[PDB]
Design a protein around this ligand. Structure first.
Ligand SMILES: CC[C@H](CO)NC(=O)c1ccc(N)cc1
Lengths: 300, 237
């Protein structure tokens, strides 16, 4: 079990760690989060009490370094940093634990939610979507735009998701215009899976990361990317059976976890009705269709 | 964006543009089978592709053999239309290629956009006008060449005959749409109007009769009467 210590908490803030959150008051003696499960990526995220504008946070994997949080009064945010002196870090953490100065990652033993949401998400792939190679962790916030959003403006601060565009020469083979537009299997299986992602695990990883950035930061470009990656599968007549079964599980846990009050802005009516009721895969997503019909029947 | 009453003079400026109407591409007769079921029989159709400034009509005749063995023909018809328009554009010299293509039905937007990905600088546009180009097959010479075709064929016409020698494109298009609207609302009466006086003839190289300027005014008046009437006979007013 790993730890992310905080130097202090000078401004009142709601701190999230994966799907959990807790309020910290201005200058409340607070020093961090302990008992963080090893083996998963994690996200630690922030919403200031004075400006609910800009949720922001850091994707990290404790196996890649010792990370801590320190508030910067000049830039006005909590910053993740890496401590390279391992003895200094063990000592700081042990002292804060002895003082009972860290809250517990509050995982219920039965609960596989975080695993199910991050099954295919890897830090190395996150770091290629969020380019900042001098840090081992990755900053994301509500306002960052995607490469594809910039094509339709600061490149260093962009989400380099894989561009998907159904009306593009990449998606459409000369001479198969109708065929490839109405059945996207060649775009899915040859262009994207074999060509760009190499395997379905990397495809699902990017899909899962896009959803999590949509959910945790309200990042609109990430929501667009999540839906496009769903629609590309559902609009393909030929999809490996194991991919359909895994997609159903992936989406089930995403819909299960989504805040009920955010479904109006995070779910695209057209994509979901097309995917569940009109597409080639309308009958292949049983778990997802059942939870969608019982939890968000209005959308449909 | 969409073409409508507010940007109507744009049709007659000096940017090359084409209307594409696909309503006569897939045509069928519906009939009973020996068993008392219903079946369709396709008949030859056509793509109506019109330059509204010059009157040049690229009439691509769609022979029934294109449908043999195909499924979902009404959907295929849109894609076949887009394929043929894209082939037409590629066949023209660069300086003759349109800068905009306006489709009369919004369901043509995606098929044409996909077939024209190669041409990022040609705008594909819908329209809010309810243009009467479906009535093109009420023009006898156009109907005749479509029905007689035994293979795929492109036939070029000027749908304005020689009108542009005496009137502007705006006026020619207005006359064209009035004639087609009339033919669409009441084909029998519309055609009676156009051909009643046997002394006025259709030249071999023309589609419409050789009316004098004064006779066109009378003709146009009779067509507006027809359209308003049928609008009464139809709504009882
Ligand atoms: C940092 C939050 C955690 C909650 O368990 N510790 C305390 O709240 C706390 C307060 C005072 C102490 N002397 C030690 C601990």
């Amino acid at each position: 079990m790993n730890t992310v210590p905080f130097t202090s908490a000078p401004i009142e803030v709601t701190i999230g760690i994966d799907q959990y959150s807790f309020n910290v008051k201005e200058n409340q003696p607070f020093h961090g989060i302990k008992d963080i499960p090893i083996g998963h990526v994690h996200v630690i995220h922030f919403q200031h009490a004075d400006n609910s504008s800009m949720r922001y946070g850091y994707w990290f994997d404790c196996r890649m370094g010792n990370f801590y949080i320190q508030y910067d009064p000049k830039d006005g945010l909590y910053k993740m940093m890496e401590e390279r002196d391992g003895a200094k870090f063990e000592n700081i953490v042990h002292n804060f634990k002895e003082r009972q100065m860290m809250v517990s990652y509050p995982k219920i033993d039965e609960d596989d939610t975080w695993y199910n949401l991050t099954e295919f998400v890897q830090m190395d792939k996150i770091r290629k979507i969020v380019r900042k190679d001098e840090n081992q962790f990755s900053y994301v916030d509500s306002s960052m735009t995607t490469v594809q959003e910039n094509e339709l403006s600061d490149p260093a601060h962009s989400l380099n998701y894989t561009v998907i565009n159904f009306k593009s020469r990449e998606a459409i083979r000369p001479g198969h215009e109708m065929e490839d537009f109405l059945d996207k299997s060649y775009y899915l299986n040859t262009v994207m899976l074999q060509g760009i992602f190499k395997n379905s695990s990397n495809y699902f990883g990017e899909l899962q990361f896009a959803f999590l950035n949509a959910m945790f930061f309200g990042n609109y470009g990430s929501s667009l990317q999540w839906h496009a990656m769903i629609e590309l599968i559902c609009s393909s007549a030929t999809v490996p059976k194991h991919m359909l079964d895994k997609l159903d599980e992936i989406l089930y846990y995403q819909i299960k976890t989504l805040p009920e009050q955010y479904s109006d802005i995070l779910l695209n009516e057209r994509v979901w009705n097309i995917c569940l009721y009109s597409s080639f895969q309308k009958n292949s997503l049983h778990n997802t269709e059942k939870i969608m019909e019982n939890k968000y029947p209005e959308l449909l | 964006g969409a073409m409508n009453s507010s940007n109507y003079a744009e049709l007659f400026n000096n940017d090359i543009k084409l209307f594409v109407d696909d309503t006569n591409v897939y045509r069928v007769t519906v009939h009973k089978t020996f068993e008392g079921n219903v079946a369709t029989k396709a008949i030859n159709g056509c793509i109506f592709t019109l330059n509204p400034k010059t009157g040049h009509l690229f009439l691509k005749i769609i022979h029934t053999s294109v449908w043999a063995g195909q499924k979902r023909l009404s959907q295929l018809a849109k894609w076949k239309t887009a394929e043929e328009v894209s082939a037409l554009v590629r066949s023209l010299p660069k300086e003759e290629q349109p800068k905009q293509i306006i489709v009369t039905r919004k369901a043509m937007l995606d098929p044409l956009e996909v077939h024209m990905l190669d041409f990022p600088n040609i705008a594909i546009r819908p329209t809010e006008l309810r243009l009467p180009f479906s009535a093109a097959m009420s023009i006898d010479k156009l109907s005749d060449v479509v029905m007689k075709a035994t293979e795929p064929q492109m036939v070029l016409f000027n749908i304005y005959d020689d009108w542009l020698d005496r009137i502007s494109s705006y006026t020619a298009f207005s006359r064209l749409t009035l004639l087609l609207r009339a033919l669409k609302t009441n084909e029998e009466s519309a055609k009676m109007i156009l051909l009643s006086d046997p002394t006025i003839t259709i030249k071999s190289y023309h589609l419409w009769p050789s009316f004098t300027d004064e006779q066109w005014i009378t003709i146009e008046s009779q067509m507006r009467d027809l359209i308003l009437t049928e609008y009464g006979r139809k709504y009882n007013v």
